[PDB]
């Protein structure tokens, strides 16, 4: 709810280059945005639309700069016999970064067999650590053709573990059974040899070829990491969307020996259960939870008709090994809710991690929608706390706002994690920054709350006639986490006998008026600021309503303009918290 939508950062690339098909962060003491543009033309000799990954600077000016992973054209196997085909290889179709490492891949990279003259899409990746850049093509082996790893398209999906191991997905291996390949980043760079096109890594973990019944399953279509057997080692989660006769499945493998741990299964044919997966602890128990997207899921309405709205399953990992699974349905028809699922970290810093789910083809004019969901003790809050809208109309591809996104990185040192959203159909990427969250404890006391009309204590200035009076005291205290100012300026309103066109039975002593405005400067972290005030009852003869309770209403708001930071990022009040409170007083009978 605290994402800044007024002035988000808009990055753009060459038109038709699908700038924003894949996004991530880069944190080496400077900060950067990583954007994939798999259809981007490069200066590589003879290579048309090889694709590139751009490093965009967030600081000051908005400049994306291409990262040179590979400047060379097609290597030759022999004289007049090209070894590879880098044209239209979709390099930058998937980008993943960890500290000083940047991993980008080309899923549609094809290469020549070293036996005969073929053109097999084994896929290839480039890994860049600081200065050294190496190639990584684990499917480019002696196991050729569709029966082997020839059509693997390695790097279709990728991820890092917490112990610097790479997880790579290849949906085409073994007649499209798919495959997960995992290598330690140290062996990838160390065993790298530019004269060897099929490099053997000693510590490699890989799924093996299975029976023919498992063909056309697309394992490795999407990937995610997290611990699921409590041994500290990130385990491998992967969507297998065509498995179980297009019911779709999700496989979990142990991250030490590639042994099978757990399975999830779709509940509808061709819903593409497993299109996207994510793993993050959503209920603050330090047990990673599984999020599985099924964008083509059809739900029945009150009218009984099917409608394609998409579905995400939320599976909470119990200590008992099981999963407590719930399901979250999309909101718009054909919007394909659940196409992308991004863990946000603790977006609002309330102690529970949050997550974003996109419907890239929703909203007016198919401009894309992103939904923000907050975690809590009982799991994920099913109702979104913020709706992110695409602003850019379509010309041929739809905009696909939300088709890729990345969160969980505090790029502005504001104490809150921010969010990148890609929209490749309009060649754009957008950075949404999280606003600081102010928790306010407001108070309102009315004493005495039972009013004797016959008492008349407080004298009123100018008349000898005394009136029945009581005290109205309102308190204000605030604090927040991260970077927010110290001094918070509040504007507070009080209205007596609020639910009264009808006559006001209670007025403030000094103003003789039912309404009172007051500016209140409070300090974050600091003690509670109060102001007491005297109100009085009208004379008994002035009104016929004695039964109805006189409600004292207190409303407060903040100066967002003045609380802003040097970057213009204005704080926001915490949600669930009332920007007003009410207390009622009664007249004696």
């Amino acid at each position: 709810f605290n994402l800044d939508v007024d002035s988000p950062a808009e990055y753009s690339g060459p038109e038709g280059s699908y700038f924003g098909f894949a996004v991530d962060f880069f944190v080496p003491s400077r900060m950067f945005l990583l954007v994939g543009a798999p259809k981007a033309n490069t200066t590589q000799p003879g290579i048309v639309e090889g694709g590139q990954v751009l490093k965009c600077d967030w600081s000051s000016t908005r400049r994306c700069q291409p990262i040179e992973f590979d400047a060379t054209g097609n290597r030759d196997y022999a004289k007049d016999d090209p070894l590879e085909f880098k044209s239209h290889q979709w390099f930058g179709a998937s980008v993943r970064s960890k500290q000083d490492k940047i991993l980008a891949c080309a899923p549609l990279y094809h290469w020549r067999t070293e036996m005969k003259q073929e053109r097999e899409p084994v896929g290839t990746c480039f890994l860049q650590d600081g200065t050294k850049t190496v190639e990584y093509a684990p499917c480019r082996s002696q196991d050729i053709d569709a029966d082997g790893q020839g059509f693997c398209q390695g790097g279709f999906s990728i991820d890092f573990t917490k112990a610097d191991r790479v997880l790579l997905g290849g949906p085409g291996s073994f007649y499209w059974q798919g495959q997960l390949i995992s290598d330690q980043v140290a062996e990838i760079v160390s065993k790298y040899d530019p004269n060897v096109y099929s490099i053997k890594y000693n510590n490699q973990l890989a799924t093996r070829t299975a029976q023919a019944i498992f063909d056309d399953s697309y394992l490795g279509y999407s990937v995610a990491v997290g611990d699921f057997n409590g041994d500290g080692i990130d385990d491998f989660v992967s969507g297998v969307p065509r498995a179980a006769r297009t019911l779709g499945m999700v496989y979990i493998y142990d991250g030490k020996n590639m042994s099978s741990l757990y399975n999830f299964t779709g509940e509808q044919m061709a819903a593409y259960f497993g299109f996207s997966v994510a793993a993050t602890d959503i209920n603050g128990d330090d047990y990673a939870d599984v999020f599985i997207g099924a964008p083509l899921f059809m739900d029945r309405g009150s009218d009984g008709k099917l409608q394609e709205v998409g579905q995400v399953s939320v599976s909470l990992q119990r200590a008992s090994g099981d999963f407590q699974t719930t399901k979250l349905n999309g909101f718009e028809v054909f919007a394909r809710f659940g196409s992308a699922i991004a863990p946000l970290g603790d977006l609002d810093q309330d102690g529970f991690n949050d997550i974003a789910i996109a419907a890239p083809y929703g909203g007016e004019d198919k401009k894309g929608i992103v939904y923000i969901f907050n975690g809590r003790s009982t799991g994920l809050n099913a109702v979104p706390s913020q709706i992110l809208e695409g602003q850019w109309a379509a010309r041929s591809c739809p905009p696909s706002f939300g088709y890729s996104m990345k969160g969980a990185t505090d790029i502005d040192k504001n104490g809150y994690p921010d969010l990148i959203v890609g929209a490749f159909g309009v060649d754009r990427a957008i950075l949404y920054r999280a606003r600081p969250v102010i928790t306010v404890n407001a108070g309102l006391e009315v004493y005495p709350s039972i009013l004797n009309q016959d008492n008349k204590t407080c004298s009123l200035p100018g008349t000898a006639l005394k009136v029945s009076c009581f005290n109205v005291r309102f308190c204000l205290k605030a604090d927040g986490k991260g970077v927010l100012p110290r001094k918070l300026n509040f504007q507070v309103e009080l209205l007596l006998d609020k639910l009264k066109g009808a006559i006001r039975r209670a007025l403030f002593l000094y103003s003789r008026s039912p309404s009172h405005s007051k500016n209140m400067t409070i300090s974050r972290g600091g003690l509670m600021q109060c102001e007491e005030l005297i109100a009085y009852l009208r004379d008994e003869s002035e009104f016929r309503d004695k039964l109805t309770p006189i409600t004292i209403f207190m409303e407060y708001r903040l100066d967002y303009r003045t609380a802003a930071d040097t970057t213009g990022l204005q704080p926001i009040l915490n949600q669930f918290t009332p920007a007003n409170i009410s207390r009622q007083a009664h007249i004696l009978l």
Binding site: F21, P38, H88, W90, A93, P107, L108, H110, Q117, E118, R119, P121, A146, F151, Q153, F156, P171, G172, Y175, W176, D215, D216, Y218, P241, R242, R245, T246, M269, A270, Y272, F275, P295, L296, M298, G301, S302, D303, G304, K305, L306, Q307, E308, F334, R336, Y361, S396, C397, P398, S400, Y403, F424, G425
Partner: protein, 455 residues
């Protein structure tokens, strides 16, 4: 009850319940009518906007083979206005009957993958054989032809020069280069023309076993003028394949990430021109278009695919599955069986603005027995009538009316439904500054003064 509401406005009285009534007299005024007349209310002043139906066009169901097509009536009634009080439901009695003799359109959509070579030799004279049998069951039978293989892109297809020119160059065997979907023959009465088209077909090939049928199905359903679907006739789309199907985002492997638009993309050559541009359609997209174009989908698939396509068919209204032999020897019997199957099945479908609306169905099939939560009838002799009780309810008072269509699946005849909400009173049609409320200190409406007058 209807009391304790608030008795503020007659309009708000109707909101708390469909059984509630208001007495707009100065003679908790909101209460049930049985109570109101006895409490001391008047006959002409009790305002009850009760839910009701108004039959507009209710022609009796025609039966017994009619030569004049415009006299054919297969659903009754045909036009209705449904005035619904919010909360007060209403049950519609819909009757459906199939006519003996009725035009049938058949579009033969065949997989032309390398596994389908032996099938082709047997279908060389399917046309004359199919139209000969169908001539008995209907007087207007029309057949058309289309073929498919796969999106001609990597990785679904090998992309070396030799493999592109001949994708069976590895066997070595002669096949045509892979193509997405070709619409060869527009629906015609000439069955002999269909035969000749088959003998000229040539087999393709590709790599992966599932194929790009859904691309073809979508195009066949949507392209009405090109394919030649008659307006008031059964639209039969026979899908012949021995393989699974690609759907949706399978094309991401090929770098195709723009969703299917469900539009017609048949060029000057009647070929699908977006085969390499758009994604495979989704089941939800196919359902949407098949229903809109009233196309009944028949899955003639081999044993290994039967169970898979059965599950698909359960999501697609009007869809059925026939067990095709390895050499397609039984395609005649499958088509006839399927036709006769739809010829006895009656499914209701509810189209239009039905979102946020409560709908329930009970089916009165065969002997008279009632099926709860069902809008489908089976085992019916052609001529037998199927009656359905469609219960419609508006949950909350709406602003504008709803256009709804109830129709049998596959048949052209339909039941138009104009559902208009009634949430307002007659009394609110209000005297501003009336002399009834102390020299015009307030307005008078619904028996109550809105400034208990300002005296």
């Amino acid at each position: 009850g209807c009391a304790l509401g608030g008795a503020e406005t007659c309009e708000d009285c109707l909101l708390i319940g469909p059984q509630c009534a208001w007495c707009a007299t100065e003679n908790e005024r909101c209460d049930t009518p049985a109570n109101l007349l006895a409490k001391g209310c008047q006959l002409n002043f009790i305002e009850n906007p009760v839910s009701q139906v108004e039959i507009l066009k209710n022609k009796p169901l025609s039966v017994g083979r009619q030569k004049n097509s415009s006299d054919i009536v297969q659903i009754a009634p045909q036009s209705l206005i449904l005035k619904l009080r919010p909360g007060g439901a209403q049950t519609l009695q819909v009757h459906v009957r199939q006519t003996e003799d009725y035009p049938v359109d058949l579009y033969y959509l065949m997989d032309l993958s390398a596994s389908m070579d032996d099938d082709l030799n047997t279908i060389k004279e399917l046309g004359s054989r199919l139209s000969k049998e169908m001539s008995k069951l209907t007087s207007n039978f029309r057949l058309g032809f289309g073929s498919f293989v796969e999106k001609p892109v990597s990785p679904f297809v090998k992309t070396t020069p030799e493999e592109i020119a001949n994708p069976c160059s590895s066997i070595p065997y002669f096949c045509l280069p892979t193509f997405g979907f070709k619409h060869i023959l527009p629906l015609t009465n000439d069955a002999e023309r269909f035969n000749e088209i088959v003998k000229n077909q040539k087999i393709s090939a590709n790599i992966d076993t599932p194929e790009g049928g859904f691309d073809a199905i979508m195009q066949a359903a949507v392209c009405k003028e090109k394919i030649g679907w008659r307006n008031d006739s059964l639209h039969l789309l026979v899908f012949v394949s021995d393989a699974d199907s690609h759907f949706g985002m399978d094309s991401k492997l090929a770098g195709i990430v723009c969703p299917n638009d469900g539009l017609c993309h048949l060029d000057s050559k009647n070929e699908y021109s977006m085969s390499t541009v758009l994604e495979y359609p989704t089941i939800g997209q196919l359902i949407d278009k098949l229903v809109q174009n009233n196309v009944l989908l028949i899955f003639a698939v081999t044993q290994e695919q039967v169970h898979l396509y059965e599950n698909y068919a359960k999501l697609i209204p009007g869809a059925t599955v026939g067990l095709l032999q390895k050499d397609s020897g039984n395609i005649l019997q499958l088509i006839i069986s399927a036709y006769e199957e739809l010829r006895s099945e009656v499914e209701l479908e509810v189209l239009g603005d039905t979102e946020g609306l409560n709908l329930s169905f009970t089916a009165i099939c065969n002997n008279g027995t009632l099926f709860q939560h069902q809008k489908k009838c089976s085992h019916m002799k052609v001529g037998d009538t199927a009656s359905f009780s469609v219960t419609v309810n508006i949950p909350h008072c709406e602003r504008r009316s709803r256009h709804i269509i109830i129709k049998p699946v596959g048949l052209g005849d339909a039941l138009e439904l104009l559902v208009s909400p009634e949430c307002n009173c007659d009394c609110q049609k209000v005297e501003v500054n009336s002399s009834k409320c102390h020299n015009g200190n307030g307005s008078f409406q619904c028996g109550v003064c809105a400034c208990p007058r300002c005296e």
